[PDB]
Each structure stands twice: as C-alpha cells, then as structure tokens.
Amino acid sequence: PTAVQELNRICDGMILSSILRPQMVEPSLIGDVLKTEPFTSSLEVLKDIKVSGLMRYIKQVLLGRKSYYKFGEEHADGDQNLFDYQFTGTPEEPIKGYWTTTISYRDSKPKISLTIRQEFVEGGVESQAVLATVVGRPHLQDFLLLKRKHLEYSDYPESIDLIEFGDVKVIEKTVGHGQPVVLYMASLFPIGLTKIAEQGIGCHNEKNDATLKSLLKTAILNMTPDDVSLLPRSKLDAIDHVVRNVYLRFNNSSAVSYGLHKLQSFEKILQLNGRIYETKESTLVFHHKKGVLVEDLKGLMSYKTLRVSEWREKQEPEEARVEVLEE
Amino acid sequence: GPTAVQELNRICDGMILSSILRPQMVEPSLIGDVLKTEPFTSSLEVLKDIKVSGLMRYIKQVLLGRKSYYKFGEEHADGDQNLFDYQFTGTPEEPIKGYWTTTISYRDSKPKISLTIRQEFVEGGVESQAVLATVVGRPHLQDFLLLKRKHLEYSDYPESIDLIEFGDVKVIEKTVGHGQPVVLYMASLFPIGLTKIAEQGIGCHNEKNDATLKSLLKTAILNMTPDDVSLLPRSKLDAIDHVVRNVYLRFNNSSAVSYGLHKLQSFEKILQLNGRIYETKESTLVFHHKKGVLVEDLKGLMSYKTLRVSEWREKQEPEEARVEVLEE
Ligand SMILES: [Cl-]
C-alpha cells in the first residue's frame, strides 16, 4: 500500500476498536493501532498529505504530536471566496418534483452552508431554506453572500431571489473549547459535554468492511434488552450512527440476512432510535409486528405515513411466474 | 419589467419553444421573431455588462446588432487550470439512488474538462468508476493525475480514490466545433456537417411556458404521421427523447396519463425507437403497446426490461381506506 492507504487503515483501526471499546483519543491509541496497521512510508511523504479529522490527528501523532486531541481544534472559518456545491436533483431533472442545492464556504468547520430545497407545485415554486452555521457568525451577511452564489449557479434564479432572510431557518453549532474526547461507536464524546460528534466511517477495503459489519452485530449481540434501556441518549445516538452507516452498505436481501434486526436487544434500539433505515437499495422498516417492510408507493400499509409492503426474498419458483413482457 | 437576464431567460425559453414544431437555424431572424411576443424591455446599455454563455449570450449579441448566425465551437475556452470547480451529488453518508458522485473541473473550460468519480458500496467495500470528460489532444494522463490529487485532497484522501489508476478511467473526448452553423430543433443543437447533437437546457419553468411546452410537444407528434416518424434520423429522435423525458418529469402519474401523448399513433412509433420506460414526477411508467399503461411496482407480476410493473389505475378511495395504519 501507499502512505494514503496506510493512514486510512490506521484510522479504520481506531473506528473499529471504538465499536466495542470506548477509548480516549490520545497518542497511545494510535501507537496501539500501529501494531496491527504499521506506517511504513517515510515521515517526509506524510507532510505532503493534506487531511482533516482523525486522519490528520494520526498524521500529527506520527510526526511527533504528544498531546491528546482537543475538541474544537479543527475549527475553521473557511475561505469566504471559495465555495462547494452540493445538489440533489435539478430544475431540468427534479427528483420526485424536488431539487435541493447546498452552497458552503470551502474548508469551513463546522461547515457554513445555505441549503435551498425547492419543489414545483401548482402553479409555482415552494422553497425552504436552511442556513447551517456557527454561533456568533454574521447570519444575515452569510445568508446574502451564499444566496448570491445560489442566484449565480441556479438554472432558475427567479425562484431564489424572493427568499428573504426572514424565511430562513438557522441552525447554530458551537465550537469546542479544547475538551479531550472519547471515541466510541465512531463518535467523539467531549468530556463535560452531553452531545457527540459523529465521525466518518471509512472501511473501504475488504477486511475493514467485513469487520465493521461483524463488530456492530457483536456489539449489539453482547447487550441485553435491559442494557440498552440503560444507555444514555448520547450513546444511543452514536450506536445509531454506526447502525445507519452499516445498513447503507447492504441491498435489501443482504441487510435482511445480516440479521441484526432479529436480535432481541436490537428491538430495544428500534424503539429508542426509530424503525426506518435506508439501505443501498431502498428504505426498510424493521417492524415489531409485521417484520421487515420495504417502502412501496403501492403498498397497503403505512408506517408513520410511509407506504410500505412486506419485504420478500426472491424465490426462483416465484420469479419464474413473473410475466416477462415483450419490449 | 424583468431584469436583463430574466428577459434573456424568457427569450431563450421562446426559442426552445419555437424549436418544438420545426427546426430553426440559430440566426438573428429567429431571435427577432421571438422578440414580437417576448419583447426586450431593458436598455441595451445594461445588457452590455451581463455575463452570459450559450444561447443566452448569442441572444444578447443579436440584441446588440449581430447579423451573423451562431457558429458551433465559437465558445471554446481552455479554461483556467489553476482554478477548480467542485460539485457533488450524494455522499457516502447520504447516497443518492445508491451512489455518490464528485466532479472537479477546470474553471471556465468549454467543453468542460473534468474528472468525475462515482462510488457505491459493494461487497468487500467500495467500487469506483472514474470518467475524464475532456477534449481531443489534451494531456489526458497529466490532467487525470492533477484532478485526482484534487479529489484526494477534497475527500480527506479516501483509500478508494487513491486506488484508481489511469487505466481504470473512461476518457470521453469531446470535439470542439469548427464554425458550423447550427439548427435548433427539439431543444437540441444540430451542427450542420456533424451527426451529433448538443441537447440544451429546456427551461420553461414558469407556469405559462410549462403549459406551452406540454402543448407544443403533443402537437409536434400529432403533426407527424407514423411514416414520418420512421423516416427521422437517429439525431432527431434523440432530440425528441430529450424533450419527452423532460416533460414526463413534470407530471405525476395521473396527470401523465390524462396528458394523453402516449395514446397517439405517432408516439407509439416513437416508443418503438426510443423505449417505453419514462420516469415521472411520481414514479415510473411503461407505455406498453400490448398491456397498456403500466406503473413501477415492486410487487408486480410483470417485468419490462427487468423493471417490475403493474397495470396503472386511477387512485381510488376504497383502496385507500383499506391502508393499514401500523403501530409505531
Ligand atoms: Cl407482452
């Protein structure tokens, strides 16, 4: 592998060790991971690799950092003249009548962004804007700059220009003040705070992908329903972060045979975190009465207004009865 | 009245709309005829400083007196190879239809020189497909290695991107035009002397242009006989496909059916040549010549090119009232 791959593997090893074992993010954790995932490139090449998050913390420890990771040390205003564009559908090609665009300041952490969700409804456009930002920012001034970038990048700027700051929902994140953090279930728990900071789960290679799936199930299998009832909300939310990332990796059949949803203690997770999970293929509902359900516009059941039907594994005698149509 | 750009927008809308019934060479008389019903309010002095591209610029230039017709390739620009544009649809934490895709390109390049990396979760991790959209004669490998470093630096150096070798990349080389005049027909440019087309943004997002587009399409197909359709070049059929698909994305399933384009002889001959599966605003329909109108349905007892479908039916309340509300 390369230095990039090695850095990835060390980061995967920490994420993976956090599934069963909370650990303080400090140099000896990286030292202990290095036993299984050594770093064999030279420190000089490491300096050319520009990273953030735990990747960058690992990089710094390999370069000699001895201090523990401090919550909020990555805070960046960003470049207020460089912008990232995220889009979900377009005006030319909406997704089920919707298109969403998020423009953000490049390299801001927490990210400062204006998201505008839009929809064609008789006989105009309905817009919803959310400014996700940080306490103390100049919210009206950030909205206007970002709105201007929305007008310049939009294939339909007429619908944007009428959105006023009074219509915007604001969400403010706070920067940490250097608290040390515990890594557990791919999430940072800053000492003294009650919230968590979910971390990205890599595990893009064969071994780490399979071990991620197996450790999640092992984590849940080793909790009784009463254990789960005793978990604080912050730990429930971190578990939710790993659970949802794992289900995104499965199609419907693989998610079902994975069988996490069959564990008695996972049913307690479902009651506390929700029953609705996105897979690679679609949306499933792990229902306690009806079993596995699959989102289905033509379904004859509704779970919290989502129409669903019973999910069914493909069976060769049934597939053989499907009428294959002439083209 | 509307600003100088909203004016251009409406004039461009008007050209696209005029291209539905007949092909139109892109030349000043086309613009002038559009100005009869969509007149340009603002002063030409404002218009001098607006930054536009594509057809909206050619409209601008014609407003400023240009007598020459539009020339294919006249917009070529190698772009700024020190400055980069960054967009993405989907992320590893919220994939869109199972994928996430990132595109990084050279600022102001036309054709756009870009590296797109699309990824999905598969067994054993992540699969990637990379596409370098570029121009004949570029240094493809150097562009790739430059844009790949950007991707790594933009994505927090995921191991899956670093694994992508130049030999894994699909290279799509666009041709630059050579000054050919161009015909606009069904929202697509046909450069004379070339066999390819360039689909254009269709626009028409206001209420009146939406309805006009829908009306003009049905009329354009009505104006054709089945024999007419069987004589059209593949170029013209692809342009028609462009407009048909944009229109069905504007309907829910019920409105798509009462729109009734699918019921026309000449459209059935179109279906035979472009396919029967059309995404709508609501789901997906199959306009079948034997079974009738079908609708995507994972429970379907029929499959059309592997899509499971059922027969379409109007929403009724005695099916609705029986929907079982589930315990939370
Ligand atoms: Cl058939």
Author numbering:
A (entry chain A): 2, 1721 to 2046
B (entry chain B): 1 to 2, 1721 to 2046
From the study:
The two genome segments code for four viral proteins, the nucleoprotein (NP), the glycoprotein-precursor, the small matrix protein Z and the large > 200 kDa L protein which harbors the viral RNA-dependent RNA polymerase. The L protein synthesizes two distinct RNA species: (i) the antigenomic and genomic RNA as products of genome replication and (ii) the shorter capped viral mRNAs during transcription. To initiate viral transcription, the L protein presumably uses a process called cap-snatching. It is assumed that the L protein cleaves host cell mRNAs downstream of the 5'-cap structure and uses this short capped RNA as a primer for viral mRNA synthesis. Here we present the crystal structures of the two terminal domains of the CASV L protein: the cap-snatching endonuclease in the N-terminus and the 326 C-terminal residues, which, by analogy to LASV, might play a role in transcription.
Optimization of expressed fragments using bioinformatics, limited proteolysis, and thermal stability assays led to the C-terminal 326 amino acids of the CASV L protein (residues 1721–2046; residue numbering refers to the full-length L protein) with N-terminal His-tag as best candidate for structure determination. After His-tag cleavage, the purified seleno-methionine-labelled protein was successfully crystallized and the structure was solved using the single anomalous dispersion method. The protein (called CASV L-Cterm) crystallized in space group P212121 with two molecules per asymmetric unit and the structure could be refined to a resolution of 2 Å. The protein crystallized as a dimer, which is not fully symmetric. The protein monomer is U-shaped and consists of two separate domains, (i) a mainly α-helical domain (domain 1) composed of residues 1721–1793 and 1894–2046 with a long C-terminal tail and (ii) a domain (domain 2) consisting of a large β-sheet as well as one long and two short α-helices (residues 1794–1894) (blue and green respectively). The second domain is inserted into the sequence of the first one and both domains are connected by two long flexible linkers with barely any additional contacts. In the crystallized dimer the two U-shaped monomers interlock with each other to form a ring with a hole in the middle with a buried surface area of approximately 3000 Å2 between the monomers. Most importantly, the highest degree of similarity was seen between the L-Cterm domain 2 and the PB2 cap-binding domain. Domain 2 of L-Cterm also contains an aromatic residue (Y1872) at the end of the homologous long helix pointing in the same direction as the F404 in PB2. In conclusion, L-Cterm domain 2 is structurally similar to the PB2 cap-binding domain, although the typical aromatic sandwich for cap-binding is not complete.
